[PDB]
């Protein structure tokens, strides 16, 4: 294809490989603690095997700048400046009973990829700064703080 060189898809949506067709894109279903239904949770725009669950939320500047509604979590909990994963949101492990597993934030986040739990149905955890210091400190290569 060209589906790599449009608007925000050289400034923000570069590492994603769009010319590459769907497995060099394995997609992503993020769902809030303000998913207050279970039917429109964050369906944009996959994983390049290469870029992490640092993908993902920075597409919540790139799900808030290709469906005009799932609100813009501001702006300093997304990301700082449009590269990688959410220093107050992780991803957390899904099981198979839709139990919102708070504690074992080290399968999908920044440490490894979000091609680390095979499934194109996960929820997430709330941060009370227990979650912010054993995840930005494992992530000084996956929060590119330019």
């Amino acid at each position: 294809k060209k589906k790599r060189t449009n608007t925000n898809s050289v400034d923000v949506l570069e590492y994603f490989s769009f010319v590459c067709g769907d497995k060099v894109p394995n997609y992503e279903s993020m769902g809030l603690e303000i998913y207050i239904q279970a039917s429109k949770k964050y369906k944009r725009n996959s994983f390049t095997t290469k870029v992490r669950k640092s993908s993902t939320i920075f597409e919540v500047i790139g799900f808030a700048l290709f469906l005009y509604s799932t609100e813009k979590k501001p702006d300093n909990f997304e990301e700082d400046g449009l590269t990688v994963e959410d220093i107050s949101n992780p991803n957390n492990f899904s099981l198979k009973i839709v139990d919102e597993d708070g504690e074992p934030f080290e399968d999908n986040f920044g440490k490894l990829d979000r091609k680390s739990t095979i499934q194109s149905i996960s929820d997430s955890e709330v941060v009370l700064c227990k979650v912010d210091d054993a995840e930005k400190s494992q992530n000084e290569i996956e929060t590119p703080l330019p």
């Binding site: 060209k2 790599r4 060189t5 449009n6 608007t7 050289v10 400034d11 570069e14 303000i34 207050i36 509604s69 609100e71 813009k72 501001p74 330019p146």
Partner: protein, 682 residues
Amino acid sequence: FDNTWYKAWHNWALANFEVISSNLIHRHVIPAIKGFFHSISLSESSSLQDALRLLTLWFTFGGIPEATQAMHEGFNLIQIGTWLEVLPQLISRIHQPNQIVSRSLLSLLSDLGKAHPQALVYPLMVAIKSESLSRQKAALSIIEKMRIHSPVLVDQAELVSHELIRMAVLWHEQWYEGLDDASRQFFGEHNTEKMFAALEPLYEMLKRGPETLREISFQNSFGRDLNDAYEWLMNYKKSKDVSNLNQAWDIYYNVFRKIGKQLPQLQTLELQHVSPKLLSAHDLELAVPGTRASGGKPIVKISKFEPVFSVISSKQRPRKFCIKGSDGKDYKYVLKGHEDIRQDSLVMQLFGLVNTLLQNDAECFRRHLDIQQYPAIPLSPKSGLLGWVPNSDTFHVLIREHREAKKIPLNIEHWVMLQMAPDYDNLTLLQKVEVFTYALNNTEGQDLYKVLWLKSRSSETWLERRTTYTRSLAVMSMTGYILGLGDRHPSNLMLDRITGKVIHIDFGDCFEAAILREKFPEKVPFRLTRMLTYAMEVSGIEGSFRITCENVMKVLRDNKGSLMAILEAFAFDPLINWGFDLPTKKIEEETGIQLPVMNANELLSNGAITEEEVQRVENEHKNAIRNARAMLVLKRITDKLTGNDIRRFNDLDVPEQVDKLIQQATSVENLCQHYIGWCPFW
């Protein structure tokens, strides 16, 4: 038959002047105004206002030699003098199509613009940087006069016009940010042969290249190749356009990832590295880079300033501090970048209206104030030289040092909105009213007191900096309404760290904020951030709105008749304010009210060529998207604050122009609505 009181008897030369706008013979009988303007150009008539209508709404008539010999030679009897003002208007009015009496007045302006270009020449320092083509040729042959009139002063200010246009912002961040959006819609649209020359005119430029030592080289020395992978998009687009698809597929890419990795090193510069040319001026005469006001001062030099500047601090990036003026006086400046100094010249002109009509006023002149001509020249028609912003502190850092000293976030509102509201997205008017009046009852902004009240330092500098400001909400409060630009953003709502006086800064757009902005039709005079506009003064704008009742009443009627006509020639502001002031009330709710005052479509397809120029439609329709938005200051200064809008016509006088603001910073929720700039601070 005159022989008395000649100013009021010139309110006459003006009913014949406005009425007759060949017919007695009137080609004569113009002579009522033309010799009687010469009775009032005394000084009480300084009004340049009605002097332009004579040479403006005569530049339009032209006509027979009574043109110069009895009218313009009637001026050449007195003198320039007062044409220190309106010279940026005279460097816009450059083709007038009769040149034969007007080169001849442009010759005359070569003499007018040869005496005090020594001050200005700076309207010709701009002029030669943009085209005006056949009428910039006149501007270039008027340089012949400047090259006779000490070529020492004009060549120094030229050295730098250039050395600042050669320095202006960067070059390699600028060229790689003017490729960033160009061949982007050329790639995924296609624009094809449109943005085929939005990187071609950047090539030119790096024609001089590995140019100045350690920056216009360190980016083309290891940028020797930052050309070789353009000329594959050149040839073979001539020939394959899906085989060589794959080149704006690449060259696009490579240097972007470099641009960000190149935006955290764009602040501390040199100058040994880009301009060691502005390094080596050391001292020119003929700087006057912000003095230019009178001469008591005698033309400040530049005795410079840091090789190593300190840049803004925004996206735009035009080096803000101070460039040492020799009048031992550091010249305050923030250059201006890729812009328009006929907006900030009309932003000084119109601060020149207005403080001369703040001098003229009643009490309100013993208790006198005046809103501060902000120091700016146009470096390009797209650039400038601004002026340090002189003490202050703007409502974003002005709500910081509260919440700094107080330690309670700006989020808490938008986080007491992430608590009350999911946020405002969807949340119609009784709702946005709702989660307004719970993220407020809670909320308190006693801050303007508390920050007052740190200085204070008489326990009455509290009073003295306010009882300065109190009258300084009032003035540019009523100012920022009847005009426009209200601009709600906390960089606009600047406080003073000096006196506490009205600072607008970052001047948006000539017309008002409701039919703007689409981040809500925000309709308010301006804001009530209320306890920062309340705990400032006793009862929330009541001794202060006593004082908006002073300004409004005064500036409702004090000569509002004219005043108006040549504030309307901002009706037709030739090039910059044509240009920047149509696509003024923001064109996002405008173009659209009358597409079919006239025609536009089905005459641009049926003539062989009649689209180029078609004018009428579209260029005198952009002059009638103007004369249907401009008749519409004039019909928005006669039924709202003489001042038109609502249901409630007549005039609305003091009380009803007094409530048209208490209605609109309480009614209604319309004070709520704006957002990123509204930033709902009690």
